[PDB]
Design an enzyme around this catalytic site. Structure first.
Site, PDB file in Angstrom:
ATOM      1  N   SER C  32      47.457  45.605  66.688  1.00 54.28           N
ATOM      2  CA  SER C  32      46.188  46.296  66.711  1.00 54.28           C
ATOM      3  C   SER C  32      45.554  46.356  65.345  1.00 54.28           C
ATOM      4  O   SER C  32      46.122  46.953  64.409  1.00 54.28           O
ATOM      5  CB  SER C  32      46.354  47.710  67.254  1.00 54.28           C
ATOM      6  OG  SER C  32      47.033  47.716  68.486  1.00 54.28           O
ATOM      7  N   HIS C  85      50.188  44.053  76.318  1.00 60.82           N
ATOM      8  CA  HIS C  85      51.089  45.203  76.330  1.00 60.82           C
ATOM      9  C   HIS C  85      51.383  45.506  77.798  1.00 60.82           C
ATOM     10  O   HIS C  85      50.575  45.171  78.694  1.00 60.82           O
ATOM     11  CB  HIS C  85      50.469  46.418  75.650  1.00 60.82           C
ATOM     12  CG  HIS C  85      49.951  46.178  74.260  1.00 60.82           C
ATOM     13  ND1 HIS C  85      48.724  45.591  74.005  1.00 60.82           N
ATOM     14  CD2 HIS C  85      50.460  46.533  73.045  1.00 60.82           C
ATOM     15  CE1 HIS C  85      48.523  45.548  72.698  1.00 60.82           C
ATOM     16  NE2 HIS C  85      49.550  46.137  72.092  1.00 60.82           N
ATOM     17  N   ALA C 115      50.947  47.611  64.605  1.00 62.04           N
ATOM     18  CA  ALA C 115      50.617  48.907  64.050  1.00 62.04           C
ATOM     19  C   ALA C 115      51.645  49.853  64.649  1.00 62.04           C
ATOM     20  O   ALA C 115      51.977  49.714  65.851  1.00 62.04           O
ATOM     21  CB  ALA C 115      49.221  49.306  64.480  1.00 62.04           C
ATOM     22  N   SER C 219      54.878  48.035  71.826  1.00 64.72           N
ATOM     23  CA  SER C 219      54.880  46.586  71.991  1.00 64.72           C
ATOM     24  C   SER C 219      56.049  45.912  71.295  1.00 64.72           C
ATOM     25  O   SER C 219      57.044  46.566  70.943  1.00 64.72           O
ATOM     26  CB  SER C 219      53.583  46.029  71.420  1.00 64.72           C
ATOM     27  OG  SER C 219      53.544  46.181  70.014  1.00 64.72           O
ATOM     28  N   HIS C 256      43.546  56.141  68.551  1.00 69.63           N
ATOM     29  CA  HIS C 256      43.549  54.707  68.369  1.00 69.63           C
ATOM     30  C   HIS C 256      42.527  54.247  67.326  1.00 69.63           C
ATOM     31  O   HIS C 256      42.719  53.223  66.676  1.00 69.63           O
ATOM     32  CB  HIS C 256      43.320  54.009  69.713  1.00 69.63           C
ATOM     33  CG  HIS C 256      43.524  52.535  69.652  1.00 69.63           C
ATOM     34  ND1 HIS C 256      44.750  51.974  69.382  1.00 69.63           N
ATOM     35  CD2 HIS C 256      42.653  51.511  69.765  1.00 69.63           C
ATOM     36  CE1 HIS C 256      44.630  50.660  69.355  1.00 69.63           C
ATOM     37  NE2 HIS C 256      43.366  50.354  69.589  1.00 69.63           N
TER      38      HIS C 256
HETATM   39  O1  LIG Z   1      51.755  57.080  66.974  1.00 70.81           O
HETATM   40  C1  LIG Z   1      51.843  56.035  67.670  1.00 70.81           C
HETATM   41  N1  LIG Z   1      52.524  55.999  68.836  1.00 70.81           N
HETATM   42  C2  LIG Z   1      52.645  54.893  69.593  1.00 70.81           C
HETATM   43  N2  LIG Z   1      52.095  53.719  69.257  1.00 70.81           N
HETATM   44  C3  LIG Z   1      51.405  53.649  68.106  1.00 70.81           C
HETATM   45  C4  LIG Z   1      50.709  52.529  67.476  1.00 70.81           C
HETATM   46  C5  LIG Z   1      50.586  51.131  68.009  1.00 70.81           C
HETATM   47  N3  LIG Z   1      49.523  51.098  68.999  1.00 70.81           N
HETATM   48  C6  LIG Z   1      49.760  51.270  70.432  1.00 70.81           C
HETATM   49  C7  LIG Z   1      50.198  49.973  71.106  1.00 70.81           C
HETATM   50  O2  LIG Z   1      51.507  49.519  70.737  1.00 70.81           O
HETATM   51  C8  LIG Z   1      48.442  51.665  71.094  1.00 70.81           C
HETATM   52  O3  LIG Z   1      47.572  50.526  71.014  1.00 70.81           O
HETATM   53  C9  LIG Z   1      47.752  52.877  70.464  1.00 70.81           C
HETATM   54  O4  LIG Z   1      47.651  52.737  69.022  1.00 70.81           O
HETATM   55  C10 LIG Z   1      50.178  53.050  66.298  1.00 70.81           C
HETATM   56  N4  LIG Z   1      50.483  54.367  66.174  1.00 70.81           N
HETATM   57  C11 LIG Z   1      51.209  54.785  67.219  1.00 70.81           C
END
Ligand SMILES: O=c1[nH]cnc2c(CN[C@H](CO)[C@H](O)CO)c[nH]c12
Ligand SMILES: O=c1[nH]cnc2c(CN[C@H](CO)[C@H](O)CO)c[nH]c12
Ligand SMILES: O=c1[nH]cnc2c(CN[C@H](CO)[C@H](O)CO)c[nH]c12
Lengths: 283, 283, 284
Positions: C32, C85, C115, C219, C256
């Site tokens: 991301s 995902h 991320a 992911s 996000h």
């Molecule tokens: O705090 C989090 N908890 C879970 N996931 C996550 C991510 C990675 N992003 C996720 C997908 O893998 C999703 O897109 C929401 O960020 C960045 N930050 C976090």
């Protein structure tokens, strides 16, 4: 998700065409707690069979009725009976009513459950404020928000760290002395587990050490869709049994016990919920 | 679950029609544990493919044969080879045979498996008595009892904290001295994990600190449905490898090493199962 | 239970192979808001996922839905700009499909990027964490992309994962970091995959912390598993885009939009780090 937005809205409109009640607050009654619909004034009852797209309650004692009424100045809809993953329902079915509540204009959901006590300081018949939850089914894929997201309902990634309304919790705490009970109102973490079979000692010991205070097989998915579409969430468990933590107990968990503990706790739960209603913010 | 109750009766009536054997005890043989049928007298053999609703065994170490015979006097039926969730099988296919053994009039189930050692003390070739399990797929919805319950087998909500018959375990402990072995008989917690890929160091450490002594990908589902229909369960693992617990090692788990250790222990298992048979109580 | 046949992976491979002149050694999967990683490629060739015969769609923001071929710094690369995902409701054997196509392409090294929300107290937003190990929670309970009949021609029935993250590359990333010129150190830790789509509660994050995991995402692990299934070398890193909410008194929450923006802030750092990494990767 085998339901479209258009599915929810038809259910929501069916109800609007069939009752004059317009609920602000929705309340889900867990096992043996069906009796909170008792103090509702001007109540109108629907069997789930009557309602377009409603799943059925198959587990005792879930009556399978949707009840509208007034409780302590508040316009309510109650789920006398809920649904579980272990009956084989996908989570988008189990949580279906929550979206239809939101379409009706409900802004608060209270979720109730029977739950097995993990924390050593809990006795049976304790009410526990749900402060937080641990979602094991969710961790591994079983989450009612999986699939396409509909922004008319909420975000692709809603936060859950503020799920349980902090303010209502503080209110119920200080409110408790009005119950005049010889036992303190417990606060704690609810862990969801799928079931339908009860837990092993080994499994209990892990749950306890994950930090969970009580265990059941419900509720969490409802909260998660509720918050996704922005409702204020309040939850509490009734501690019906203390889970077996040692290998020398000849004792074992059983639904009969959990329904019996839900009956002893009727008047105390009726009163607690009654009081609670008054503390819910206006639209 | 995709199976009607009648589907089970057909398999049971079919077996009952094709053998005069009337098993009391059922025995499920794990990877490279197929040698346990060797000691059956008046053995009658069936390919799984002959038996109307039976799944197939695809993992090396699993012969795919059902054998009725007498093990040290006792009327048995053995699953030479079992089924796993990772083969693509739902849990209702995996545990289908247990249900048919119950209708066969079987009152006792012995589950066997190969396992990776999580407990630092355990060595390769050790036999661990399964005292208790941790069902991780069960925590998140993968439980063979999911869906409508048939009272003709059990209850909607069976307890599991007494899964592994205490008396049989204690007796096995007393009786281990007859084996003339230099290691003791181990007793511990089996954690089921779904694989099919082996655990990372990090996963091994969570499993270790969750309270698990051994790991594998089978057994627990069988036990859950055995207990649900009243059979008395006994279980043990052959510890075939020590799971990797650190990053400097250049060793990695492989199934071949698992079947290699199964072969080294064939005499001792046969001798242990024999026993075990003498002390299983009559109907 | 996989819908794809070997033939299917093969059609896709051969299709890419005739539609591009590139022959990539390395595949990079961008997480991301890490899409910016494509910008430094030379003689680039872009394919929309929708052109490629068996590819799925990328739905989430910060994931462009593109396959890009080119040279990063003399190193022949294929980049997934966007990824799939499980929470989008894809089977894990769709999530991971392109990994086996990269294998058939002649790729021998896979680098996965994500991320992640930091669980480790010492991590700051903007940190790069080398992934040393993962905890595969959907795997524990059945959701593993390898579930079902095994395709012998890709890999074993029961492949080991304890060696999944190439040790030598991590060491080279470690000793080489002095080149990056950051007064922050390169972090190292365990990635815990959670399914989502909702973010974790405080108590959840506490269990994840005590499970020994340093970073949480939704992911990566499935791609790593099927990479090792077909025996690709695997290197993993997380951008720590937010500190996960770890106390009840806090008014902050994971979102996000913050995740996407920390990626945009960190891009030159990632750019630079990825290129030095390409110097580290062994030649065929
Ligand atoms: O705090 C989090 N908890 C879970 N996931 C996550 C991510 C990675 N992003 C996720 C997908 O893998 C999703 O897109 C929401 O960020 C960045 N930050 C976090
Ligand atoms: O000990 C328990 N372990 C797990 N769940 C539980 C419950 C809640 N009841 C379950 C539904 O979630 C089920 O109906 C069995 O009572 C009451 N007591 C317990
Ligand atoms: O280390 C192990 N980790 C997980 N499982 C396992 C087993 C049992 N065998 C597995 C199925 O249960 C599988 O067949 C691979 O051996 C033996 N050893 C191990």
């Amino acid at each position: 998700n085998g339901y479209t937005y258009e599915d929810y809205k038809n259910t929501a409109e069916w109800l609007l065409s069939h009752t004059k009640h317009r609920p602000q607050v929705a309340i889900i009654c867990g096992s043996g707690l069906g009796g909170l619909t008792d103090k509702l004034t001007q109540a109108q009852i629907f069997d789930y069979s009557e309602i377009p797209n409603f799943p059925r309650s198959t587990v005792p004692g879930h009556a399978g009725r949707l009840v509208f009424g007034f409780l302590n100045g508040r316009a309510c809809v109650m789920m006398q009976g809920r649904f579980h993953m272990y009956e084989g329902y996908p989570l988008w079915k189990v949580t279906f009513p929550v979206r239809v509540f939101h379409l009706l204009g409900v802004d608060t959901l209270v979720v109730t459950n029977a739950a097995g006590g993990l924390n050593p300081k809990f006795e049976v018949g304790d009410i526990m404020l749900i402060r937080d939850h641990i979602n094991l089914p969710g961790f591994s894929g079983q989450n009612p928000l999986r699939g396409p997201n509909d922004e008319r309902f909420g975000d692709r990634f809603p936060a859950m760290s503020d799920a349980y309304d902090r303010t209502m919790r503080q209110r119920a705490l200080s409110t408790w002395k009005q119950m005049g009970e010889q036992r303190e109102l417990q606060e704690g973490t609810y862990v969801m587990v799928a079931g339908p079979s009860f837990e092993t000692v080994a499994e209990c010991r892990v749950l306890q050490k994950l930090g969970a205070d009580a265990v059941g097989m419900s509720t969490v998915p409802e909260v998660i869709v509720a918050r996704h579409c922005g409702l204020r969430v309040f939850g509490f468990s009734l501690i019906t049994n203390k889970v077996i933590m040692d290998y020398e107990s000849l004792e074992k968990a059983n639904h009969e016990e959990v329904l019996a503990a839900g009956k002893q706790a009727a008047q105390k739960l009726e009163q607690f919920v009654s009081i609670l209603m008054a503390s819910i913010p206006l639209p």
